[PDB]
Each structure stands twice: as structure tokens, then as C-alpha cells.
């Protein structure tokens, strides 16, 4: 049996698996009422990707495809409909057992980024280009990636071409005010209104009493307005990548991991790493975790459902 | 001795180490007259990062720091000076044995991206983001001295003394004025000061061999062009080699580009100690090979091993 391992990466060497951001802090929120069921950054400990999770850090909340036309505006700004392809360029296939094309955002909000286009040229033989700031509202009824198309809006009023290769590079959020509907635990309706999501990665929760979810938190940029919005992922993208490479069989439902100083080897705190790919800790306190960023999780042993964690 | 390995990732599961882009194609250019000495995506086979190379995909061509003031500049747009910190938040330190802060762009050009700010609050912070351009050929581009200059279309809404982040997106232009050359290093300390602590240049030693690159096509803000960025190894290899730290048992590892399911070899390449690939190819341009394939380590070989033509 191939021994289970975690990569040797300190907190400042990790990236968020739900948005292209470095990990800033570890974080807990025991009193969260929402169901935690994110679809990016989902990977079992034995290497099975779930939800909309894919391997590329550049693929997280990214879109690839083609603008079909300008569309009448439901909100302020100029609006465009784009069909989406898979990130690897292959055609959109609705029959795929996934919630949406891999990399599709898994939370409600106005995602801010840049739309860029490079025209095709069938033979001075150099394609025309354009790029503009764009916003994708994932709560909108026009957000239907599982049906093969989404909608984005621009400040630019005319300079977006139809029928040309189109890329969305995510940067952050457009806003976090009431109208912007930012909720990191509210899944988009991937197939739009009056149609339910399918093939979802399962919800996660601490089964053990006195335990809470431990998150890898990143603070996400804002185009404007007031706020300090954050994105919490269950595991960093590097873990997803590592677990996928190793595919080590899970010898139990829970892996005991210790957050350790890289040179001494001394334990700072311990956590449970569950089979479906998430962490729990024994913590009554909420908020950012006070711990050195110069530390990493090290696998200790497989334990049973009854193992009790030291408080942190 | 820990056995050397490569990760099992097909071409469509790889990321460029010199710009935040997926790998699009394998590429060769035998008649390249330029010296290849890029500083990002540099890692020895036994796991030693070099140049400005760091582990984070979000760190590549990214900047973190603080805007000091608006500045005057002869080119178009509104211009801003920002101090740069290390990407992990640690202070800029000129004595670190690196060419520049890790993640600093390693090529000449106008890099297009978004400058974003979140204000500190010593007591909900105000935020702003704008399109920005960083000209790495500019004399004001001095990251090794701890500060750079970016320009915006926005004329006023950039705050001084606040946490500032640059998210790279692509290039502003590739016309003559834009000075895009992916093999021309910036002057990290500006004019009249030479670059230091560089990762070494790479070249095929063997006759009939050429460098093999992982190519990504980079977005353009405007204008005509199909610019590309070539890296020696994808970011995932850099990350993998760093984790493994497997001892190099010779100066060259024989690797085969293989179909993932059958295991059949499509072509072979030399993976050199300093972290780059060569192949026996006379042709230039994209390599015609399925993206559904990956490099698999075969064995360590000596200096006289001859590659099959591809």
C-alpha cells in the first residue's frame, strides 16, 4: 500500500483552490449556518477529483469559448453572451457527469476579471486583439455554464467581437454590496432557473462533537466599494494536485495531520484530514488562526472516528 | 538514493512557469540567435530553484507592495511609483542572492494586468482596481532596487500608501514601441547597473539538438499579433522537482513523451541537469504531438547518448 503523504509547503507556498489567490491565513467559523458544499478544490484523499475541480491553477474560475453576440442589458453596462468550451479546448458536452465545465466558479457573486480575444485567421497574417474588464454575475439566470453558455458585462460599449476565441481571466470581485449577492457558500444554478444542479461534490461537516471545519482562506480583490471579502477552500490547489498524483489508498476514514515547524519538527497544533478531502480541528474560537505561516501539515497516521484532537 | 521522477500530467494539465498561462503546445526554434537565459521556471533536476523562480502560480509576474506617489513620464497615460515587497509579505531585502524579488517578470515588454488596492484600517476598507501596464524595459523598472512604475488609463483613482497588488493578464502591445522580446532580460536594477545572481543560460551542447520549449500564447490588450511565451519546464515540474529533491545520477535524464494509456513512445528528449529539454529536431515551430501525452523518465544517460530524430 502506497503511503499517504502531503506536500512540504508552508502556508505562504500554497494557493487557493477556489480562486487564483495565495493562501493568506488558516480560518475557522464554527457558527456558520450555511451548508458547506463548494465544488472547486474537491478531491478525495486517494486522488479522485470531484465537483468542478480540475488541476490547472489558471483554470480556476476561468472560462474559454466564443462570444455569440451583444445582448440587451439586464443590469447597467454592456452585455455579451458567450458559449463556453472546456478549458482544454474540447467541445462542451452536456452529457458529462459534472455539475458544469471544470473550473466553473462555485459561488454566488459578481466575478471581476478581464475578457480577452484573439481573432482566428485562416491565412500581414497576424490576428487582431482586444481585452476589456468584465464582470460575470454567477447568480444571474443567464449564468448557465452547464447548458454551455454564460453572460458577462463590460464597461466597454462596442469593442467586443463575435465569433472569435474568447478568454476570461479572473481577478477578483466587482462588488460586495447587497445588490452584488456575494455568498461563498451559495452554489450557482449551473443550468439556470428552475433546474437543479447535478453530480455535485458532497457537503462537508464535522461529524465529531466539538470539532469545526478548518479552511484555507484567501482575501479576494475588489474592483470598488467597501469590504474585505474572502474565499475559503477546503484544501489548497497543491494538495489537490498532490493527492491526484499520489493516489494513495485511504487506510481509514480520517488522517491525523500535525501543523509543524519546518526545521524543528515541533507540533504547533493537530487536525483531522477526512476521506472526502477536508480538515477539522478542536477549536471553540472563530476567525483567523494565529499560527506562523512558516509551518505545514504533516501526515502522522490513520485514525478512527473516535480519535480526539487536542484543542487549539 | 531517491529515484528521479516526473509528474504524470498531460500537456493540457500543465501551466507555464514564466506567465500564468496553460501550456498550449510544445515548440522548437533551432535557428534562434538569442541567448536563452530566462529567470522564471528555473529549477535543477535535484530541486534547486534558481533565478527569480518561486513556487506559486499566482506569483509569476505578480507584484505586491505599496504605491508611493503619482509620477511624471513622457509616455502616454497616468504613471505611478510603487515599492515592491516579497510576494509572501516579507520586506524587500537587496542582499538576498536573487536577480530581483521572486516572481518578477523575466522578459522585456509591456505587461498588462490589473492593479488592485485594499486600504489598511487601524480601527470596512475602501477598494479600487484598474487596468495597468508595467513596462519592464523602462529605466523606472527597478525591482531589485525595491520599486517599479506602472501606468494606468485611469487618471486619478490610485491611492498612495495602501496595499497594492498587480495581477498579470497579458501584454499591452507587441508593436515596435512596446519592445516585446521574451529572451531579453529586464535591467532589474535599472540603467548603468548590471544584473546579478542569474540562473545560467541554456543551450544544446550536442550537435543536431535544439531546445524544446513549453509554449503558451499570451493575451493582448490591443493591436495585431500572436505573442507567445516559451518556458523550459512547466510550473508543475518546478513544483515537483522541488518536492522530490531526487539526486541527479548523471548530467542528463532520458525522457520519453508517451501516450498515457498504451504507454507507447511518441518521441524522446534529453532532460538536462540545469532543468531544460533538448530534442533532435531540424524543424522550427509547434511540435505536432497529441496533447494527450506526457514525459516519462526512462533512465540517466551519459554525454554521448544520441536521440532519435523527431
Amino acid at each position, epitope marked *: 500500500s502506497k503511503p499517504f503523504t502531503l506536500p512540504i509547503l508552508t502556508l505562504g507556498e500554497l494557493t487557493n483552490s477556489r480562486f487564483p489567490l495565495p493562501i493568506d491565513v488558516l480560518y475557522t467559523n464554527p457558527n456558520e449556518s450555511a451548508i458547506v458544499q463548494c465544488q472547486n478544490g474537491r478531491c478525495t484523499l486517494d486522488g479522485e477529483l470531484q465537483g468542478t475541480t480540475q488541476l490547472l491553477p489558471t483554470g480556476i474560475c476561468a472560462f474559454r469559448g466564443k462570444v455569440t453576440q451583444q445582448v440587451q442589458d439586464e443590469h447597467r453596462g454592456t452585455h455579451w453572451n458567450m458559449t463556453v468550451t472546456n478549458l482544454n479546448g474540447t467541445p462542451f458536452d452536456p452529457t458529462e457527469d459534472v455539475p458544469a465545465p471544470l473550473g466553473t466558479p462555485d459561488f454566488s457573486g459578481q466575478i471581476y476579471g478581464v475578457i480577452s480575444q484573439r481573432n482566428t485567421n485562416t491565412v500581414g497574417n497576424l490576428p487582431a486583439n482586444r481585452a476589456h474588464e468584465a464582470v460575470i454575475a454567477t447568480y444571474s439566470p443567464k449564468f448557465t455554464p452547464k447548458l454551455g453558455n454564460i453572460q458577462f458585462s463590460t464597461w466597454e460599449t462596442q469593442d467586443v467581437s463575435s465569433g472569435q476565441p474568447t478568454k476570461f481571466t479572473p481577478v477578483g470581485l466587482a462588488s460586495v454590496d447587497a445588490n452584488s449577492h456575494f455568498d461563498q457558500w451559495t452554489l450557482p444554478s449551473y443550468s439556470g432557473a428552475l433546474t437543479l444542479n447535478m453530480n455535485l461534490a458532497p457537503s462537508v461537516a464535522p461529524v465529531f462533537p466539538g470539532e469545526c471545519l478548518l479552511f484555507f482562506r484567501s*482575501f479576494i480583490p475588489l474592483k470598488g466599494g467597501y469590504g474585505n471579502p474572502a474565499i475559503d477552500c477546503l484544501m489548497p490547489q497543491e494538495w489537490v494536485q498532490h493527492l491526484y498524483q499520489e493516489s494513495a489508498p485511504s487506510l481509514s476514514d480520517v488522517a491525523l495531520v500535525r501543523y509543524v*515547524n519546518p526545521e524543528t519538527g515541533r507540533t504547533l497544533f493537530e487536525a483531522k484530514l477526512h476521506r472526502n478531502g477536508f480538515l477539522t480541528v478542536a477549536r471553540n474560537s472563530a476567525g483567523p488562526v494565529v499560527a506562523p505561516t512558516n509551518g505545514y501539515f504533516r501526515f502522522d497516521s490513520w485514525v478512527n472516528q473516535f480519535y480526539t484532537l487536542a484543542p487549539m | 538514493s531517491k529515484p528521479f521522477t516526473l509528474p504524470i500530467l498531460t500537456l493540457g494539465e500543465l501551466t507555464n512557469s514564466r506567465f500564468p498561462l496553460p501550456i498550449d503546445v510544445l515548440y522548437t526554434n533551432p535557428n534562434e540567435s538569442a541567448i536563452v537565459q530566462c529567470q522564471n521556471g528555473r529549477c535543477t533536476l535535484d530541486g534547486e530553484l534558481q533565478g527569480t523562480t518561486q513556487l506559486l502560480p499566482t506569483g509569476i509576474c505578480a507584484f505586491r507592495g505599496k504605491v508611493t506617489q503619482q509620477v511624471q513620464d513622457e509616455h502616454r497615460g497616468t504613471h505611478w511609483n510603487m515599492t515592491v515587497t516579497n510576494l509572501n509579505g516579507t*520586506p524587500f531585502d537587496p542582499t538576498e542572492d536573487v536577480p530581483a524579488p521572486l516572481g518578477t517578470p523575466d522578459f522585456s515588454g509591456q505587461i498588462y494586468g490589473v492593479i488592485s488596492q485594499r486600504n489598511t484600517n487601524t480601527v470596512l476598507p475602501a477598494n479600487r482596481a484598474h487596468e495597468a501596464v508595467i513596462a519592464t524595459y523602462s529605466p523606472k523598472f527597478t525591482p531589485k532596487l525595491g520599486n517599479i512604475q506602472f501606468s494606468t488609463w485611469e487618471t486619478q483613482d490610485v491611492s498612495s500608501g495602501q496595499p497594492t497588488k498587480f495581477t498579470p493578464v497579458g501584454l499591452a502591445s507587441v508593436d515596435a514601441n512596446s519592445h516585446f522580446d521574451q529572451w531579453t532580460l529586464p535591467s532589474y536594477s535599472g540603467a548603468l547597473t548590471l544584473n546579478m545572481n542569474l540562473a545560467p543560460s541554456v543551450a544544446p551542447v550536442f550537435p543536431g539538438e535544439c531546445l524544446l520549449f513549453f509554449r503558451s500564447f499570451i493575451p493582448l490588450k490591443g493591436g495585431y499579433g500572436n505573442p507567445a511565451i516559451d518556458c523550459l519546464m512547466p510550473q508543475e515540474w518546478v513544483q515537483h522537482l522541488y518536492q522530490e529533491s531526487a539526486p541527479s545520477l548523471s548530467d542528463v535524464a532520458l525522457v520519453r513523451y508517451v501516450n498515457p494509456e498504451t504507454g507507447r513512445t511518441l518521441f524522446e528528449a534529453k532532460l538536462h541537469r540545469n532543468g531544460f529539454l533538448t530534442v533532435a529536431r531540424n524543424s522550427a515551430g509547434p511540435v505536432v504531438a497529441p496533447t494527450n501525452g506526457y514525459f516519462r523518465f526512462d533512465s540517466w544517460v551519459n554525454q554521448f547518448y544520441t536521440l532519435a530524430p523527431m
Partner: nanobody
Amino acid sequence: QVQLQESGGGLVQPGGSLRLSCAASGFTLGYYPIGWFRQAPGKGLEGVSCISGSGGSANYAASVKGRFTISRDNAKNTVYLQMNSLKPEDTAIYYCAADLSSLVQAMCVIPRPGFSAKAYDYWGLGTQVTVSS
């Protein structure tokens, strides 16, 4: 994005005095040592002074011992560095950071030159101190 914030830096004549403040941005100071550091032009990051989590124990680099005073006001979430009898050698960018290594110790540690900065946390963007004529 959660970090300490340094302020109070300016231009001063030799023999003059300055007081720097290290304040928490977006959080509350907890129980751990806070250190002041500086990076002079062309020189490496160096430790200047530290104060314990209690605020009762302090340490100083030999170069500033007797001239600098560090203090803790947890109520205002600020650590202060009072700089007296300033010299032109004191000219630098001043930074503060937290030591999260051992949440128990009693006496501060001033790191020797060439130390790893990432062993400390919540680094700020720094404040500039210039001692000139």
C-alpha cells in the same frame, strides 16, 4: 492581507527624536512578541528591538541600546518605538513583525543578521526614517 501597519516616519536632524507606531490592521494584538526591524539602503533586514507578549520584557540591538525605547499599548492595539539621539546610521525603512513561534517564553530574541524573515508574521509595508541635515 492581514498585517501590522507602521507609521510616524519622517526626516529629522541628528540627535533628534522620533516615535514610531506599529498598529494592527484588521485584527487584535494577541499574546506574542512584537519586533521592530529596519532595512537601511543597500543593507539587509536587521532586528532593532522586541517586546514580549506581556509588554514587561524588552530587548535591543547593541547599536540602539540606551537610545531606543519599545513599549506596548494593547488597548490601542499598538506597539511603539521611541527613537532618541538619532544618528545618520539610523536612516532606514522600519518594519514590525510578530513572533508566532512559541505561543511560552519570557525574554525576547533579537535575530542575528541574515535571519529568515518568513519566520516572523504580519509584516507591514514599513515607514521611512531619514536622519539628515
